Amino acid sequence: SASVILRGANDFMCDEMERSLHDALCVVKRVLESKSVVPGGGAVEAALSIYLENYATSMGSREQLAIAEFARSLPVIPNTLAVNAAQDSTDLVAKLRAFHNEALKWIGLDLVNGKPRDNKQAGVFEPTIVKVKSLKFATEAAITILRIDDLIKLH
């Protein structure tokens, strides 16, 4: 347990600083949970994008386009990050790919600055377990909705 005494000239200050004290309270944790980790910013998704893009070309059959699209539904993460960070998605997104296959994996999007930066060197690391669950859940989420041909909710 603990007891972080948070002061504040105004309750309105103690409320946002308490919500901020919880932000880096869960970041410092994910960084030490599990040895396996990955450089955020979009690097990860970027890698899988190109790699899976090649995987589709090696599989063939309907699974070629099925995997291709998948590799196109991954770079959406860094694409949005740039959009919500006041950066031109298309630019960074594309620039990320080139800088993702030149300076290796450790190349993601640093919304703070707004340019493909070495998240590994920067310190941006997230427990791989998060990535796994993210994909797993999201994936299973689709299969189900695609498995729906008709329903019956009724008032």
Next chain:
Amino acid sequence: VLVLSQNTKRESGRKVQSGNINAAKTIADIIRTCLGPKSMMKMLLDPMGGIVMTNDGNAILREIQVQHPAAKSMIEISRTQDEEVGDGTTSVIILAGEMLSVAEHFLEQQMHPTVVISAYRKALDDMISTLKKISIPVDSNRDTMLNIINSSITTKVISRWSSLACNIALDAVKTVQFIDIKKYARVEKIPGGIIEDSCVLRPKACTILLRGASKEILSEVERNLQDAMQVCRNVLLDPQLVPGGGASEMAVAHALTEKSKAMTGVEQWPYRAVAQALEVIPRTLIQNCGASTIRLLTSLRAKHTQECETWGVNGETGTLVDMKELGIWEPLAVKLQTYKTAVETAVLLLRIDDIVSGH
């Protein structure tokens, strides 16, 4: 498809900045006129034949049934500001509205919020340092305190006997001053007679015994006295005071603008936008006088940048005069919090890009 419960409106992106900003801007222009000694008290008539005549922005926002959340947050801005000191309730509202009015413009030029807000939050920090870099430090001291408390009783129903109320507030605050506590001054209002038959009752906590011919008049003598005590509570925490009449706003403005060209970049515009926004105070001010706002603004910044900051808008003369010479001073705290409460609100308000309601 019904992604979310039927009839649940959901503004997104640009559709949010519009409906949110304007709504707040509009509500800020409503009580706007109720600014200055030339205030235009509206006669609020609730949907039942009611008749609410008032000048205070808060009291007005608490009578006008609002439906849009954006305008509701405003009524909350006047709720916090009005509780702290009291007056200036319209100030914080007008500013918060303008900031959004000047922001939306930049949105037209397609200036992504991230950049804007960033400049807003930082600009907010500038005003604070500015306010302190030009405040006039005045003395406790019974004499001074009186003047401060007096200026806080010269606009209400208690102004009739402000002098008396002042000595009462001065004593009640100077006695319960250990940081002074605003919970050690008991107010015992008793209907009957004139507010002139009052007397502070003494003590780690006195018992001020007010008097009021009526029931509404007696409660008013309690509130104004409490506010008269507040300013005194500020001279104990914020012994600083800056010239009113807009003199302040103009300074911070001329300063911020200058800083804009020093910072350059995309945020070079917002800086000015905030400075130009502070100009509304002296603008709307002179407006309540029927004088030329524009013309005044010109001559204002004119003699202002040339001869110190001691110049301000003289509503009684419809011209620019040395506030300091006229003896027009406003507690730095008054202004200090204003800019703060304002910018802050506007900031997070600009972060709102969607609101899940029901209809």
Next chain:
Amino acid sequence: VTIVVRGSNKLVIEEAERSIHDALCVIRCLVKKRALIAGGGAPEIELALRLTEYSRTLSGMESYCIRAFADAMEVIPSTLAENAGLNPISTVTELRNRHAQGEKTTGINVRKGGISNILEELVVQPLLVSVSALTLATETVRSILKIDDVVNTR
């Protein structure tokens, strides 16, 4: 007998009950019938083929209808390839041919994208399920095909 099904999770046990229930049904159908066929479209096409021939030989309205009857069997395999991604029509005719060259077991492996020997794929169903299927629905089709009127006041 009394099968006691005790497990940790209810959804796990309830599934054990249901599944075992099916593990018995197929057996209870195997007692009054000790036969098993490769289920997967093989038996449907096999019939659709024989019946069709049973039509040309019989001739007349008999033949026409029968061919139609058999063609109605082609729906079983078609849906399979359909709910698998494979081209229904193409996959069927593909099976019809290999069904004449291969064996009755020749069915459609909705997990390989093409024809294959179901008997070697470990896919067989008791002859009862089949036999019944044809009889159950067939009689019905005849029970409502006779009803020349449906007036029951109000």
Next chain:
Amino acid sequence: EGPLSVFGDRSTGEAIRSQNVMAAASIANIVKSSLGPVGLDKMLVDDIGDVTITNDGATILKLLEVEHPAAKVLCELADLQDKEVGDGTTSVVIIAAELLKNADELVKQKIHPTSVISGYRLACKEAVRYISENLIINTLGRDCLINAAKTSMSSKVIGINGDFFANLVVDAVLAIKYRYPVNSINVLKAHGRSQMESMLIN
């Protein structure tokens, strides 16, 4: 026939699978703007009038009046994602919708959903492997946490002093972090003194 009388749902054919996409779309895009250090919070004000301004996608999907069943699936993802790791709750909802949209394309091409599903499965297993082969296995680091702490507070009311706290944040975690129990870091808020004296009882 008159199966389900008045007041009865049931969507079939393309009319439904489509509705599901748009259903997941609108929902996705919603919390889509709440990811990143510059997250754009929202003000969830339910029926009773209670105002709730949050940034977390999960809390948003749990307070969002949703009617369509499919859209509720995303709320479940935000739930599973929140009770397993926390952040990234919006990501799972964003990638979910995209996968659907990219699929529709293959659909309007005559590729039965089954074929597509089998594609997201094998791709999934592989996409994860490609991640496992590039898994930085470190042992926690401080120097990195403070930066993700100073920039996570620079957009609110605690940005002015986002430093003093950022430290108090990387300290409270690493201190009571094994699995970091959040129920161990109480944030007692009290009025008085500026936010500069904010201490962390060690």
Next chain:
Amino acid sequence: GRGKSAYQDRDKPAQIRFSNISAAKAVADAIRTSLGPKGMDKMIQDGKGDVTITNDGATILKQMQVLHPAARMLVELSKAQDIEAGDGTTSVVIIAGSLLDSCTKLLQKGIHPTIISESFQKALEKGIEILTDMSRPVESDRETLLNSAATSLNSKVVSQYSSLLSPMSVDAVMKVIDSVDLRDIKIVKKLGGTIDDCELVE
């Protein structure tokens, strides 16, 4: 004029036959999308609200309010097929809708409904013959018994313990073989331990 009771339906030969075929075929193509190991589930939320997501045709038709009679016929096939074999309950319906589909053509041509009913029946006799004529005749033998019990417990959640559920299913029947009666095989789901501890009480 006034020979029928106020508010009354009177479908004639050509009129009635049409409705029936429609109702049925419509119900068939409804569950014809859940057939197969890759079938699609259907959330059956009745009035009360208790949803019933099932893939089995029978369970689907038994939860669906059916107003028209002709389509109720199919609900009877699913039930019967599920009590006379268990699986393939979705097939009997689909095929039924097909047999009706092809015959209609004949009707709209000039073939009396009776002749058709006689023909189809004749093909049925031939169908059952061939099918059974080529079925692999199996053996009492506990071996073949564990084959219809194992390959029938897979694809489900019990597959994890099918190697144990099969033997019990064989001993449960091997005893009730007075023909086997499923009423002598009392099943009771208890909460304790795991499915691997299950036991068959004689």
